[PDB]
């Protein structure tokens, strides 16, 4: 059984747990940083979006970020930087008909799901300061132990 | 299979896949119509830790952050729609086959993305498809769109 739902909050997720993210229509889904070498934001882009510059507030900064979604699925744009002064790069995309995404702190790395349902897979970004990574979660969420990653992947891919 | 052709600069014909077969070229393809579409495919080898690399795209020197945690090759699809804009990392093809594609079709530029063997096609829109030309830095083949199923097979299984 999933642990949740939890309402949107700002907290320090424990190690070895998946945060399963369940947006409705929030532009910004998750902001995670340790304020030293990790800044990850997941943005949500609805279906049938023409290439356009959209405005997002990320870690209090006003950013204009080019997005497109030619599909009838939802896209999570994973935006990353490793330096406080840098611009965000569009690192990964999750293309989803479940509208579920993932975040986990494990093994000196921050993990997300990417690719296109139902073949979304995990990948990571490296950090020397995992313990200080804190998340503003803008959405309803659940917590799943890493031991149950297979169910977390089933949910992300099939709902 | 029509090829292999050598690296060249030319205007690909509408409704044909260019099937790109790098060895170790870091810039695989540069395509533009010099008005509303610039695409560059960059090749990032297996097991590259997060770093800044230098690429010359359309005569401009760029510093682009890249990373590849996997045992697959990654093609980073860099894109802009305006000559003054920086490139954005728009898509990635994560490949065991070291094959990528490009096609001018239906007022769009088409490429493959995702992870083999489930890579699929998506497009970027242009209002001037006919003027899109490509510098191709790799050996390549030419497959009609009528045989796109074979082109997807090659992308996904080699």
Residue numbers in the entry:
A (entry chain B): 1 to 159
B (entry chain A): 2 to 159
Show me the paper's own sentences about this structure:
The protease-sensitive VP4 proteins protrude from the outer capsid shell, forming sixty spikes that are responsible for host receptor interactions. Each VP4 protein is cleaved by trypsin into two domains, VP5* and VP8*, corresponding to the stalk and the distal head of the spike protein, respectively. The distal VP8* head interacts with RV host glycan receptors for viral attachment, while the VP5* stalk assists in viral penetration into host cells. The RV VP8* domain adopts a classical galectin-like fold with the central structure being an anti-parallel β-sandwich formed by a five-stranded β-sheet and a six-stranded β-sheet.
The crystal structures of P (strain BM11596) and P (strain BM11596) in complex with LNFP I were solved. The VP8* of P BM11596 strain adopted a classical galectin-like fold as similar to other known VP8* structures, with two twisted antiparallel β-sheets consisting of strands A, L, C, D, G, H and M, B, I, J, K, respectively.
